[PDB]
């Protein structure tokens, strides 16, 4: 079910509302954010998209879901590359 | 000249209004206060020549309505740069008119 | 979404049958703080100013479903107000200049300068209360066309205040031994003839409901001031060979009569809602006693030796 | 003869008295007056340094308007609307939409002072302040009204503050916080020392300078005339500030001024910044936004505050870095979300404009440049779906403006989040979070437009439901690229 | 309450009385008054159709000036002087120099009527007329004055009427003849029906249309405001004329208006015709000079004269041919002798302009074009001594302007001469000779500037000596090609 | 040949003033070109009738000065400031008219005042129109524009007073329709003995065509006599008769009159720079004064008349 | 360092909007403050006129340089902004700072 | 000896002052007029330049002098081609 996050994509100029699902993996999250960023204001590039709590050091496991991750609805996340 | 004779034999009367906030309200007033006459307008940017055949009335009441603020007939000379026709002005209206038909 | 043509005027005005006037264009429907009942201002719905307005504007027992349809019967805008008042005020200023040239003030009846010090020059406190009160009705009125009449009325009260200031000083120059310019605050605070007026105004300034504030200011306080202060002062001046004051006050009465005109028009707009008639008359019955005592005490003091 | 003003002026302001039939605190309640407990007698030394009196005021204001309206009438055929750059016309639309009904609101802040200030000279000068703002509201509705017949976007001179469009909500959040939503003494020092002696000079004199270069004298002449009023009624602030310092309230005064300046800066960065560096045609850029900022806000305004006795704000260095970066990203967001604007944002990134931007902001092309390249490529390839968004930006719970940062080569972006009373808020800066913490009861149950979005208040829950909610009444009203992407040809 | 103007207006003009201690003829001498023997009583039915009264006059004229000056002050940094085409700048220079102190002289015309008209309503309207012309003189000195510091040619706004420059003499001959040099009733019908309802509309409203196209709103706004006064005080003519006609003087009124219109025509052909068809840049030409003439002079003004009871002038066909031809040669005369002007004439003959000229004036290239071909080839080939003259043009003894005709393929030129009291006079038209003959004493001992050159009054008797005589104080003052010949490059 | 010179900051004739030229300097000074050529004032035949008239009545006047153009209006009025000032005074007078009519002022005057007014006041429109005509004459003859300009404004002032008098005559007629008000002024001006000194003075004043003598008789003899023997005694009579409007009206008209006297005095002072003018001015003043005195005596005696 | 130098200034004086008061105010500033350098920055729409520490404009000098009768209050028709604190009376306006930075 | 005439040259647009000499032949007068017209506003041409009284039919003889012609000073002449 719907899970709103605020997401900042690496190299974009802003944070956007992106509504993901409760059982989305981090991979699936990264891709739902990419949709609104890459090839719109951000060059495509090679590498693996990772999701983290905003500004934090530790990346979430790619295969971890939103539910398992402990994020709250409307929290802020960064989508960044390895 | 055919051209000259044609230019001279006109019966066009009405105000020449200088560029400013009285142009559109005088045009509109001319149409409203002369029902049934065709009003012609030549726009030269710095002024507008407004005319009808034989006679053209501007009443103070309509001009006030179209202008959108209180207005006295006397104030018209702030913007009336010229006119065709003879003039008969009073507290309620001004009339541009010809005695002759050419 | 559909495609639509340009309008000749504001969207809110395009249903008008006549061409909108300067007044319509610059004055109508400008309070946006009436759009959302929960949140007058763009803040927490519970911020102190939002609670102030929900209580003292929105919950007023004086109601109408379209306060914004009110129209100043004079249709004044800032520009035409200044044109008009620059005419009246430079007329009054010219009177001051010429009556000073004629030394009018030396020629008043013996003792007049004492009646002025006691009955005229403290008016500056009364007129400043009207100024304060007018500003309150302005900030609380539920339509900009109402608020606009209050702004102009606020300026007019300061005009009157400034008249009084100027003439108190001017009189003191001819009569330096009467407390002119020195004792007005004491008089306002302690002289009995001023105490009914000051009590009335202090309470009036603490009626915070907008309809109550409007009714008490414009329908009770201000007509009382016209009939019990302005006109009797003109009569008295006439009896004491003061020919300046009656002319000054006639100019102030033009303002006061304009304030009555837009007031009465607001009353008539309000009385469209049949409930409003008991609301207004109740506020009138409530304040009139206060106002009558104010007049009575003023007039005994004006009457006496 | 007439007697000179200095001889009778004191009497015009001898109007405090000791109330008896009600208490002092009933007459001047603290939540409307803001006297901070300073008793009546102390407010009588208030001395406005820019005086006027009623006969002078009406005489001089009559002449000011005579000139402003005669210049408008004399130029009605200059063809500005026709011969002007479309980005210039958008400047006008956004100015009048953002400002006109805000001026009319400002009447209520002057009215607050006129009734509830305990300083008699304040109450009189605020009465002229009331009159002034009425002027400013009526002018700035009268002047655009003639363009209603050319373009529906000019309806917004009147309509913006009546809508829930996002930039209007931002204007209203600021003005309702600083002007109409506070007590008299807060208005006295927050309105006068953030907008009136500060950022109003950017929008009304910096922009006049650009309008003069663009050949728009009607506009230049109108807004420089407006600011002559402001220069007078804004001088109600210094004596209020001086009394608060003399009576032990320096800290409280400092905090109120610090907060108002920051809130003003965030609004004027989205309103004026894009205008001066992108909408205004290159040849008409008298100075950059940053250069004007250094002139008016650092050189003149902040220096005046120090002279009055305040310190540099605590956020000084954050503020100077904001100057170099914020409005570039605000521009990009207004532009990329231009359907949600009531004006037609100009992208302002041709090669020659990208060079000017690189000279006024070294490193521009490595930052915002990187986003503009993606967008440019998509326009040349005709992927127009890719230059229209499908989601909403995340918005600051204080300024009501999109959360942004520096994009591209040294990507850097920070949201300042805050938990409070069971709710999570997000802010665009440290200062904006600090402002919230100074006065939670002012802000805590406010919901920004995205809060409303997520809570089911905007149906349907899509960009298009959002546009109905924001109050657009036709397709023509929604913002488009000002040159219909003609810049892409260059 | 206030009582409305119509109920007290009659008393403002109940001011005629029967004199006793001097005679009526002493009080109103015919040389100053021009009553033509018509008795006072008859003058009392004079009824000005465009009324004003003192309180309204000062209020309304206060507002007219507030606007004129505020528009000026607000545009004082629009770069007009700096970005304007130099042909537009020249138009300003020649307008101010030819008009400003002529307006101030017009005060004396209105003062002549104010004192010596037997019509009481004329005497009051002429009093506002005095005030109006004072306004016009002060505005048209104030506005060019700020350009002094940029260009000494702008000094001629003040200096021109104080000089013997030949165009200024043409200006003063006309204005002294029609305005300051005749009796009150002559002023009433010659000034109001030649300049004020006639050629003034060309110079102050026609030129305003060009000014607005060129973006000079300070100027356009000023001269259209001026003309609002004139539309009022020029209405003193019609009732005077009507009285002349009702009292048997139609023939002498016809003669006067006929003469004044021709005199005005020749002067404004030299001032206005070159401005509209040559100096004003081509994109800013609202209409051609001749189109403007047909709008203002034939369509409006002459039509109004007929409505008031006059006939077409007897020279109607000559006039219409003159409208097609004369200003093209006056332009050529002014430009070739540009060094004698206080402005810089624009040649106005790039191919683009010549196409426009050909279209507005079919046959133009086989006429004036022949002359401009030769001029242009000399500029292109750097033979500059051949684009400056080495003698004087012969000059009309009425209009003070050079004698000209149609050049090129159907060359036609004619001088109308006259021996009179031992002197030979030359005139540029049948009409100008006829004017002279209507009132020899007005003109006979006048010497035009070429007459003066030949009688020893210009020392030394050279072109440079003439230039000093004409009042030039420095090299920068004398005219040159407006674009320094850069137009050659487009040919 | 020709020098090079740079652009001046003002008109060539003003460019050596020590001070920055004022609005008044720029627009008022040195504008009569008709004084440049003593044989041909106007650009016509030297012997045209107007050239003969100006050679005789201006150029050959006994009153002489080699720089009349240095004369300066001490009020330094231009058209623009005149209108500003008079719109102020006149809208003040018009506001008095309105208010005093609201208070039915004219009903409260002392019995019979309307008859004095019809006799002594309302025919002032003829007198004032004479000063109007006579001012226009000085304007057109005077040898400097700065002089002529003070006369233009004085001409307008005369018409202002004339219009006041018209407006009041009519307004008063509405309260007293049986006094001849607005009906019999022409007959009084022509037949009433109180008016005959004035009318004879004006008729002969209006036929003095020398500019110098026109100026001296109008402004140094006739007009100060109207202030002293007509305006102030009328104020004095209205006071005795409970007319409070007229002293106010006349006080505004007197401001105009004092301004006429100030520029007049300043012009005498300029003319006295040449010592021969002392005799010429006193000659003219002695010549005209008995006529003025007589006019006043006859008027005052009519006004008193019970 | 740019910001420090922008902030650390002592410039005071009028900001005059485009119109007929610009040159007379400049001239009045030069004359009424002898021994001060008057700087002038012209932005077309307005002109920024300043001196260090104190800048005086008297009514008399202003009226002389303007060329027409002039009361000090009228200055607000054209005084669009100002640097420094202000003190204004019938005879002059004074722009000044209490502190030296 | 100085002899002032007003001359109109064929195809030119004005009449000019040209000072000739009492003893000039008409060929010389003609040359003195041309100096101020041909190559200034008038194209050169082949042909013989002649002199006549203004608007007159009859030409003066090429050799006739000013003296002999009867012209008074300041009369108008045309210089035309035959
Ligand atoms: Fe404002
Ligand atoms: Fe403000
Ligand atoms: Fe004129
Ligand atoms: Fe005229």
Curated annotation (Swiss-Prot), chain B:
Pathway: Xenobiotic degradation; toluene degradation
Family indicated by similarity: Belongs to the TmoD/XamoD family.
Subunit structure, as described in the record: The alkene monooxygenase multicomponent enzyme system is composed of an electron transfer component and a monooxygenase component interacting with the effector protein TmoD. The electron transfer component is composed of a ferredoxin reductase (TmoF) and a ferredoxin (TmoC), and the monooxygenase component is formed by a heterohexamer (dimer of heterotrimers) of two alpha subunits (TmoA), two beta subunits (TmoE) and two gamma subunits (TmoB).
Pfam families reported for this sequence: MmoB_DmpM (PF02406)
Source organism of this protein record: Ectopseudomonas mendocina (Pseudomonas mendocina)
GO BP annotation list: toluene catabolic process
UniProt KW Acetylation keyword: no
Disruption phenotype: Cells lacking this gene show a complete loss of toluene-4-monooxygenase activity.
Protein name: Toluene-4-monooxygenase system, effector component
Keyword Lyase: no
SUPFAM superfamilies with a match to the protein in the record: Monooxygenase (hydroxylase) regulatory protein (SSF56029)
InterPro entries given in the database record: MOase_MmoB_DmpM (IPR003454), mOase_MmoB_DmpM_sf (IPR036889)
Keywords: Aromatic hydrocarbons catabolism
UniProtKB/Swiss-Prot annotation, chain E:
Annotated EC: 1.14.13.236
Phenotype caused by lack of the gene: Cells lacking this gene show a complete loss of toluene-4-monooxygenase activity.
Activity regulation remarks: Inhibited by Zn(2+) and Cu(2+).
Binding site for Fe cation 2: 133, 196, 230, 233
Cofactors, names only: Fe(2+)
Record field: pH dependence: Optimum pH is 6.8.
SUPFAM superfamilies associated with the record: Ferritin-like
Subunit structure, interactors included: The alkene monooxygenase multicomponent enzyme system is composed of an electron transfer component and a monooxygenase component interacting with the effector protein TmoD. The electron transfer component is composed of a ferredoxin reductase (TmoF) and a ferredoxin (TmoC), and the monooxygenase component is formed by a heterohexamer (dimer of heterotrimers) of two alpha subunits (TmoA), two beta subunits (TmoE) and two gamma subunits (TmoB).
Family: Belongs to the TmoA/XamoA family.
Function noted in UniProt: Component of the toluene-4-monooxygenase multicomponent enzyme system which catalyzes the O2- and NADH-dependent hydroxylation of toluene to form p-cresol. Also able to convert benzene to phenol, catechol, and 1,2,3-trihydroxybenzene by successive hydroxylations.
Name of this protein: Toluene-4-monooxygenase system, hydroxylase component subunit alpha
Organism, scientific name: Ectopseudomonas mendocina (Pseudomonas mendocina)
Gene (name only): tmoA
Curated annotation (Swiss-Prot), chain F:
Pathway note: Xenobiotic degradation; toluene degradation
pH relationship of activity: Optimum pH is 6.8.
Catalytic activity: toluene + NADH + O2 + H(+) = 4-methylphenol + NAD(+) + H2O
Record keywords, A-Z: Aromatic hydrocarbons catabolism, Monooxygenase, NAD, Oxidoreductase
Annotated EC: 1.14.13.236
Top class in the EC scheme: oxidoreductase
Superkingdom per UniProt: Bacteria
Any one GO BP annotation for this protein: toluene catabolic process
A Pfam family assignment: Phenol_Hydrox
Activity regulation info: Inhibited by Zn(2+) and Cu(2+).
InterPro entries documented for this protein: Ferritin-like_SF, MP_mOase_hydro, Phenol_Hydrox, RNR-like
Phenotype of null mutants: Cells lacking this gene show a complete loss of toluene-4-monooxygenase activity.
UniProt-recorded Gene Ontology molecular function terms: toluene 4-monooxygenase activity
Keyword Oxidoreductase applies: yes
Quaternary data: The alkene monooxygenase multicomponent enzyme system is composed of an electron transfer component and a monooxygenase component interacting with the effector protein TmoD. The electron transfer component is composed of a ferredoxin reductase (TmoF) and a ferredoxin (TmoC), and the monooxygenase component is formed by a heterohexamer (dimer of heterotrimers) of two alpha subunits (TmoA), two beta subunits (TmoE) and two gamma subunits (TmoB).
Role according to the record: Component of the toluene-4-monooxygenase multicomponent enzyme system which catalyzes the O2- and NADH-dependent hydroxylation of toluene to form p-cresol. Also able to convert benzene to phenol, catechol, and 1,2,3-trihydroxybenzene by successive hydroxylations.
Family per record: Belongs to the TmoE/XamoE family.
Gene: tmoE
Swiss-Prot record, chain G:
GO biological process: toluene catabolic process
GO molecular function per UniProt: monooxygenase activity
Regions that span the bilayer: none
Keywords: Aromatic hydrocarbons catabolism
InterPro entries in the cross-refs: MOase_MmoB_DmpM (IPR003454), mOase_MmoB_DmpM_sf (IPR036889)
Consequence of gene loss (knockout): Cells lacking this gene show a complete loss of toluene-4-monooxygenase activity.
Xref: Pfam families: MmoB_DmpM
Pathways per UniProt: Xenobiotic degradation; toluene degradation
Subunit: The alkene monooxygenase multicomponent enzyme system is composed of an electron transfer component and a monooxygenase component interacting with the effector protein TmoD. The electron transfer component is composed of a ferredoxin reductase (TmoF) and a ferredoxin (TmoC), and the monooxygenase component is formed by a heterohexamer (dimer of heterotrimers) of two alpha subunits (TmoA), two beta subunits (TmoE) and two gamma subunits (TmoB).
UniProt family annotation: Belongs to the TmoD/XamoD family.
Known role: Effector component of the toluene-4-monooxygenase multicomponent enzyme system which catalyzes the O2- and NADH-dependent hydroxylation of toluene to form p-cresol. Required for optimal efficiency and specificity of the holoenzyme.
UniProt protein name: Toluene-4-monooxygenase system, effector component
Protein encoded by which gene: tmoD
């Amino acid at each position: 079910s719907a899970f709103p996050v605020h997401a900042a994509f690496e190299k974009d100029f802003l944070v956007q509302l992106v509504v993901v699902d409760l059982n989305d993996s981090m991979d699936q999250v990264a891709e739902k954010v990419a949709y609104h960023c890459v090839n719109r204001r951000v060059a495509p590039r090679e590498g693996v998209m990772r999701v983290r709590k905003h500004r934090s050091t530790e990346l979430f496991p790619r295969d971890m879901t939103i539910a398992e991750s402990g994020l709250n609805p409307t929290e802020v996340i960064d989508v960044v590359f390895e | 000249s055919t051209l000259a004779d044609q230019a001279l034999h006109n019966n066009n009367v009405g105000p020449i209004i200088r560029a400013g906030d009285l142009v559109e309200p005088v045009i509109e007033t001319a149409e409203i206060d002369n029902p049934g006459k065709e009003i012609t307008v030549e726009d030269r940017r710095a002024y507008v020549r407004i005319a009808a055949e034989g006679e053209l009335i501007l009443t103070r009441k309509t001009l006030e309505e179209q202008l959108g603020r209180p207005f006295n007939m006397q104030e018209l000379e702030i913007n009336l740069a010229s006119f065709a026709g003879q003039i008969q002005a009073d507290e309620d209206q001004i009339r541009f008119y010809f005695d002759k038909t050419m | 979404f559909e495609s639509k043509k340009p309008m000749r005027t504001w969207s809110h005005l395009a249903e008008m049958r006549k061409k909108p006037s300067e007044y319509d264009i610059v004055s109508r429907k400008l309070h946006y703080s009436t759009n959302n009942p929960d949140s007058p201002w763009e803040l927490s719905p519970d911020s102190p100013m939002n609670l102030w307005y929900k209580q003292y504007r929105n919950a007023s027992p004086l109601k109408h479903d379209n306060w914004d349809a009110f129209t100043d019967p004079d249709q004044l805008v800032y520009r035409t107000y200044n044109l008009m008042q620059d005419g009246q005020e430079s007329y009054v200023q010219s009177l001051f200049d010429q009556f000073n040239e004629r030394e009018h003030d030396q020629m008043v009846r013996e003792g007049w300068e004492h009646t002025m010090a006691r009955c005229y020059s403290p008016l500056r406190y009364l007129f400043h209360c009207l100024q304060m009160s007018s500003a309150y009705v302005q900030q609380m009125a539920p339509a900009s066309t109402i608020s606009n009449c209050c702004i102009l009325q606020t300026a007019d009260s300061l005009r009157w205040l400034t008249h009084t200031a100027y003439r108190t000083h001017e009189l003191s120059l001819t009569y330096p031994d009467a407390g002119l310019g020195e004792h007005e605050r004491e008089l306002w605070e302690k002289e009995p003839g001023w105490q009914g007026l000051r009590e009335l105004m202090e309470k009036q300034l603490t009626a915070f409901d907008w309809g109550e504030a409007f009714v008490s200011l414009n329908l009770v306080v201000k007509p009382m001031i016209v009939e019990s202060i302005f006109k009797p002062l003109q009569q008295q001046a006439w009896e004491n060979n003061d020919t300046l004051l009656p002319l000054l006050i006639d100019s102030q009465l033009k303002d006061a009569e304009r304030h009555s005109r837009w007031s009465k028009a607001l009353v008539k707009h309000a009385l469209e809602n049949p409930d409003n008639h008991a609301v207004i008359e109740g506020w009138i019955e409530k304040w009139r006693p206060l106002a009558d005592r104010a007049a009575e005490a003023y007039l005994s003091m004006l009457s006496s030796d | 003869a007439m007697h000179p003003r200095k001889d009778w002026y004191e009497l015009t302001r001898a109007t405090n008295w000791t109330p008896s039939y009600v208490t002092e605190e009933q007459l001047f309640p603290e939540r409307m007056s803001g006297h901070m407990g300073i008793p009546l007698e102390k407010w009588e030394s208030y001395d406005e340094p820019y005086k006027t009196s009623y006969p002078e005021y009406v005489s001089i204001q009559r002449e000011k308007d005579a000139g402003a309206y005669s210049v408008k009438a004399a130029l009605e055929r200059a063809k500005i609307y026709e011969n002007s750059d479309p980005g210039w016309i958008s400047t006008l639309k956004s100015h009048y939409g953002a400002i006109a009904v805000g001026e009319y609101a400002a009447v209520t802040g002057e009215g607050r002072m006129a009734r509830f200030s305990k300083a008699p000279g304040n109450r009189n000068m605020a009465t002229f302040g009331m009159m002034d703002e009425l002027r400013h509201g009526q002018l700035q509705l009268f002047f655009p009204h003639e363009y209603c017949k050319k373009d529906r976007q000019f309806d917004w001179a009147w309509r913006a503050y009546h809508s829930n469009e996002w930039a209007a909500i931002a204007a209203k959040h600021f003005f309702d916080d600083i002007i109409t939503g506070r007590d008299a003494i807060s208005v006295a020092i927050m309105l006068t020392f953030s907008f009136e002696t500060g950022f109003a000079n950017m929008q009304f004199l910096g922009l006049a300078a650009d309008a003069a270069e663009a050949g728009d004298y009607t506009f230049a002449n109108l807004i420089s005339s407006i600011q002559t009023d402001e220069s007078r009624h804004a001088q109600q602030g210094g004596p209020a500030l001086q009394l608060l310092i003399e009576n032990g309230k320096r800290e409280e005064a400092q905090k109120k001024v610090d907060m108002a300046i920051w809130r003003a800066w965030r609004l004027f960065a989205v309103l004026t910044g894009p205008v001066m560096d992108y909408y205004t045609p290159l040849e008409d850029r008298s100075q950059s936004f940053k250069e004007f900022m250094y002139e008016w806000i650092i050189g003149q305004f902040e220096r005046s505050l120090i002279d009055l006795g305040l310190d540099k704000p605590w956020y000084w260095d954050l503020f100077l870095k904001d100057i170099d970066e914020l409005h570039h990203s605000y521009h990009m967001g207004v532009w990329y979300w231009r359907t949600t604007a009531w004006w037609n944002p100009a992208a302002g990134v041709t090669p020659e404009e990208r060079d000017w931007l690189e000279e006024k902001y070294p490193g521009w092309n490595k930052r915002w440049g990187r986003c503009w390249d993606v967008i440019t490529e998509n326009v040349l390839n005709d992927r127009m779906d890719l230059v229209s968004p499908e989601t909403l930006p995340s918005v600051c719970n204080m300024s009501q403006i999109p959360l942004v940062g520096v994009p591209g080569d040294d990507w850097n972006i920070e949201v300042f989040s805050l938990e409070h009373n069971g709710r999570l808020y997000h802010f665009g800066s440290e200062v904006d979070r600090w402002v919230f913490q100074q006065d939670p009861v002012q802000y805590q149950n406010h919901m920004n437009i995205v809060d409303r979005f997520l809570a089911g208040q905007i149906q349907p829950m899509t960009l298009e439901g959002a546009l109905k909610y924001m109050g657009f009444q036709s397709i023509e009203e929604m913002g488009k690229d000002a040159h219909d992407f003609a810049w892409a040809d260059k």
